[PDB]
Amino acid sequence: SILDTYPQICSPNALPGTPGNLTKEQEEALLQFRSILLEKNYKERLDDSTLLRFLRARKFDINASVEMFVETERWREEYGANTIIEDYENNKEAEDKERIKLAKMYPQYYHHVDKDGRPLYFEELGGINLKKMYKITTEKQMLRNLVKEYELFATYRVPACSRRAGYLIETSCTVLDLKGISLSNAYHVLSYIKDVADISQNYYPERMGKFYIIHSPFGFSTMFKMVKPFLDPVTVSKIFILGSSYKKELLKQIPIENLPVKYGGTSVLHNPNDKFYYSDIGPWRDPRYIGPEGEIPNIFGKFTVTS
Numbered sequence: 535s536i537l538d539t540y541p542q543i544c545s546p547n548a549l550p551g552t553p554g555n556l557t558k559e560q561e562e563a564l565l566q567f568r569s570i571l572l573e574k575n576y577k578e579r580l581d582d583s584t585l586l587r588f589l590r591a592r593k594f595d596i597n598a599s600v601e602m603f604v605e606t607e608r609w610r611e612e613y614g615a616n617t618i619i620e621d622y623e624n625n626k627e628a629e630d631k632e633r634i635k636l637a638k639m640y641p642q643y644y645h646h647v648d649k650d651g652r653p654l655y656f657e658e659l660g661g662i663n664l665k666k667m668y669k670i671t672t673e674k675q676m677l678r679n680l681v682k683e684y685e686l687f688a689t690y691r692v693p694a695c696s697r698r699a700g701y702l703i704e705t706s707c708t709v710l711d712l713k714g715i716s717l718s719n720a721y722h723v724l725s726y727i728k729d730v731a732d733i734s735q736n737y738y739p740e741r742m743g744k745f746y747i748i749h750s751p752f753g754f755s756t757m758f759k760m761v762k763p764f765l766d767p768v769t770v771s772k773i774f775i776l777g778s779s780y781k782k783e784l785l786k787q788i789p790i791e792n793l794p795v796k797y798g799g800t801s802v803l804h805n806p807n808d809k810f811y812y813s814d815i816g817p818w819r820d821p822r823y824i825g826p827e828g829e830i831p832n833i834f835g836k837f838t839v840t841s
């Protein structure tokens with residue numbers, strides 16, 4: 535299996551309940567959880583990493599974890615998450631074209647890793663113009679992309695990042711740049727935020743590592759109060775709204791050489807004229823860390839910048 539080609543044990547300095555750092559009870563809870571699922575005839579996604587994410591998400595309450603896992607499996611099948619990557623490749627050209635149209639307006643890109651080896655993910659929202667957004671894509675379409683990225687994250691990014699780190703990597707280090715957004719637009723996209731939060735928390739438990747919100751406008755705290763209601767306690771604990779000295783905070787978590795210059799680091803693209811919103815740079819692009827899973831497809835087609 536592919537799980538045999540990359541570390542399945544987390545760093546010994548990781549949080550409680552993570553692969554390889556279990557207490558005696560958590561270990562037994564894990565064996566019991568798997569035993570129940572096998573008995574119900576489930577066969578995929580029964581590895582320690584996957585099951586421990588569901589267990590952690592429900593504080594090791596086995597009954598709650600089974601319910602969550604069972605619901606997740608139903609959703610994946612009804613939604614088509616299980617063949618989403620396959621379906622994308624069958625219609626790649628068309629997909630890429632649509633994806634390229636939104637890149638400049640809504641930059642979303644991975645760029646290296648944080649100090650623990652987690653994929654470093656960036657999103658900029660100040661350039662978003664809703665009126666134009668609605669002419670290029672739909673809300674459901676955006677959710678589909680989010681689901682597709684979660685699957686890409688799990689099959690290509692996790693293995694490569696884990697091999698480079700020498701330990702299992704299960705989460706990402708996210709930076710949300712709100713520079714230039716208008717609070718008014720923020721309120722209008724609450725339903726989308728809610729849908730994103732629901733998919734993430736219900737079907738992709740424990741995928742959040744560190745989540746930084748920077749350049750938020752005055753009064754953002756008021757708007758975040760509209761969001762907290764549908765975020766569970768653990769999720770909230772991973773979100774950090776940074777102030778004016780945000781660069782210093784990012785530097786505590788991210789190597790200076792991996793952090794882009796505009797965020798306080800020294801990282802630049804091989805070709806200074808290339809755009810970050812067309813880039814996808816990281817271990818999963820390094821032949822030395824790519825395994826049997828093969829290399830990740832290019833999200834922006836021929837425009838994808840990998841260095």
Ligand SMILES: CCCCCCCCCCCCCCCCCC(=O)O[C@H](COC(=O)CCCCCCCCCCCCCCC)COP(=O)(O)OCC[N+](C)(C)C
Nearest residue numbers: 659662667668671672673687706708719720723726741742
């Ligand atoms: C046709 C258009 C119709 C609707 C279009 C909406 C346009 C977009 C508007 C909102 C965009 C920003 C929404 C925040 C999404 C944050 C990114 C995210 O996925 O958060 C999820 C988690 O969801 C959360 O927990 C939410 C965290 C707090 C979100 C609070 C943001 C506040 C919103 C204010 C911004 C409004 C900007 C104005 C828009 C014009 C994934 O986290 P991760 O670290 O695991 O992600 C990285 C790894 N992958 C990529 C695999 C997930």
